[PDB]
């Protein structure tokens, strides 16, 4: 299956920067969400989940078609809680009805990462909404209760290697788990993007406990937690090397996350040779807004 990026008619960097700005200004305004975490983390997770349905074998799923708008996908148990991100983005879509759904969802993740002081993430336009019958079935997103071998194999489907998987996982510095969404509870409640996932993995005293949903998770006294799949990055020697690297080099982590996240958001998309170059949006702060 081939999905060719098609630029929204007549649109250019300036149009997309205004969408970015509207998302960013709303992230600033709507501060109270999730006990003052704000919407940044959930938008990152949304961008990931709409992309992470991709299957490299047949080019089904992926961000291109915007299929999260359809009930089958919206209602995936793996997507529980992301409705909050969708409802955040609805007034943005109303204001900018010309942007495709996949472009909006992926741009929301870009904007969130950058506004939370993360790396710049180059972003390309041209995802085109596809029909309801193109929505992938539930079950393509990963389980949390599994080991390193499961994560490694899982991510081969999305054409990600060890370094890319460890880099992407660093997003688990953001936000928190919520028992009623996923059967996991806790976390740092952070809304600043840094390399502290890796630091926490290496430096905290972790205890394997059962939560109130009867699932195991790793907890520290400071209030941090790790899923079994997170903790697996220090139980596999290949992953552990990379965790140590990123714990010790903020800039390297930023650069590798940026590359991996862009790739995630673009898997499945064919960009014509004369497509615009990737856009790098200015933050509100950089614009003096």
Interface contacts to ligand HEM, rule CB under 6 A: 41-42, 44-45, 48, 81, 142, 144, 151, 168-169, 171-172, 174-178, 181-182, 184, 227, 229, 261
Judged by beta carbon, residue 227 or residue 242, the one nearer ligand HEM is 227
For the chain, the farthest-separated pair of C-alpha atoms sits apart, in whole angstroms, at 55
Residue nearest to ligand HEM (CB): 175
Confirm or deny that 176 is annotated as ligand binding: yes
Closest approach, Cβ 177 to ligand HEM, in A, equals: 4
CA 133 vs CA 67, 72, 85: distances in Å: 9, 10, 23
Judged by beta carbon, residue 99 or residue 226, the one nearer ligand HEM is 226
- 113-118 own/partner pairs: CB under 8 Å, 24+ apart: 113/40, 113/44, 113/193, 113/261, 114/24, 114/281, 114/283, 115/24, 115/27, 115/28, 115/40, 115/283, 115/284, 116/40, 116/174, 116/191, 116/192, 116/193, 117/192, 117/193, 117/194, 118/193, 118/254, 118/257
The answer to whether the beta carbons of residues 141 and 51 sit under 8 Å apart is no
Judged by beta carbon, residue 27 or residue 151, the one nearer ligand HEM is 151
Judged by beta carbon, residue 42 or residue 201, the one nearer ligand HEM is 42
The pair of three-digit structure tokens given for residue 189, joined into one six-digit string: 């409640």
Confirm or deny that 45 is annotated as ligand binding: yes
Closest approach, Cβ 180 to ligand HEM, in A, equals: 8
Q: How far is CA 18 from the centre of its chain?
A: 21
* Nearest alpha-carbon partner for 100 in 74, 73, 127: 127
Closest approach, Cβ 169 to ligand HEM, in A, equals: 6
Judged by beta carbon, residue 11 or residue 152, the one nearer ligand HEM is 152
Helix residue ranges per DSSP H, the chain? 13-29, 33-36, 40-51, 71-74, 83-95, 101-115, 148-156, 162-169, 179-182, 196-203, 228-235, 237-247, 250-266, 284-287
Confirm or deny that 232 is annotated as ligand binding: no
Confirm or deny that 182 is annotated as ligand binding: yes
Closest approach, Cβ 151 to ligand HEM, in A, equals: 5
Judged by beta carbon, residue 23 or residue 151, the one nearer ligand HEM is 151
CA distance 91 to 93: 5
Judged by beta carbon, residue 32 or residue 133, the one nearer ligand HEM is 32
Confirm or deny that 172 is annotated as ligand binding: yes
Confirm or deny that 69 is annotated as ligand binding: no
Closest approach, Cβ 84 to ligand HEM, in A, equals: 8
CA distance 183 to 158: 25
Confirm or deny that 163 is annotated as ligand binding: no
Closest approach, Cβ 141 to ligand HEM, in A, equals: 8
CA distance 75 to 58: 23
Closest approach, Cβ 121 to ligand HEM, in A, equals: 11
- Which residues carry a binding-site annotation for heme b? 45, 48, 172, 176, 178, 181-182
- Which residues carry a binding-site annotation? 45, 48, 172, 176, 178, 181-182
């Amino acid at each position: 299956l081939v999905h060719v990026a098609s630029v929204e008619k007549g649109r250019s960097y300036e149009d997309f920067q205004k969408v970015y700005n509207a998302i960013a200004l709303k992230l600033r305004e709507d501060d109270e969400y999730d006990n003052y975490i704000g919407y940044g983390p959930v938008l990152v997770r949304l961008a990931w989940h709409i992309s992470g349905t991709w299957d490299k074998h047949d080019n089904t799923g992926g961000s291109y078609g915007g299929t999260y708008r359809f009930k089958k996908e919206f209602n995936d148990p793996s997507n529980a809680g992301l409705q909050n991100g969708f409802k955040f983005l609805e007034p943005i879509h109303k204001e900018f009805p010309w942007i495709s759904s996949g472009d909006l969802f992926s741009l929301g993740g870009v904007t969130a990462v950058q506004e939370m002081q993360g790396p710049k993430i180059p972003w390309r336009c041209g995802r085109v909404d596809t029909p309801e019958d193109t929505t992938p079935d539930n079950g393509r997103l990963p389980d949390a209760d599994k080991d390193a071998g499961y994560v490694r194999t899982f991510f081969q489907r999305l054409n990600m290697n060890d370094r890319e998987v460890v880099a992407l996982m660093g997003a688990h510095a953001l936000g928190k788990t919520h028992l009623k969404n996923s059967g996991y509870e806790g976390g740092g409640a952070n809304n600043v993007f840094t390399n502290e996932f890796y630091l926490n993995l290496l430096n905290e005293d972790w205890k394997l406990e059962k939560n109130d949903a009867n699932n195991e998770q790793w907890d520290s006294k400071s209030g941090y937690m790790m899923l079994p799949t997170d903790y697996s990055l220090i139980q596999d020697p290949k992953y552990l090397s990379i965790v140590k690297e990123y714990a010790n080099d903020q800039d390297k982590f930023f650069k590798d996350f940026s590359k991996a996240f862009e790739k995630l958001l673009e898997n499945g998309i064919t960009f014509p040779k004369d497509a615009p170059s990737p856009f790098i949006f200015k933050t509100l702060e950089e614009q003096g807004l």
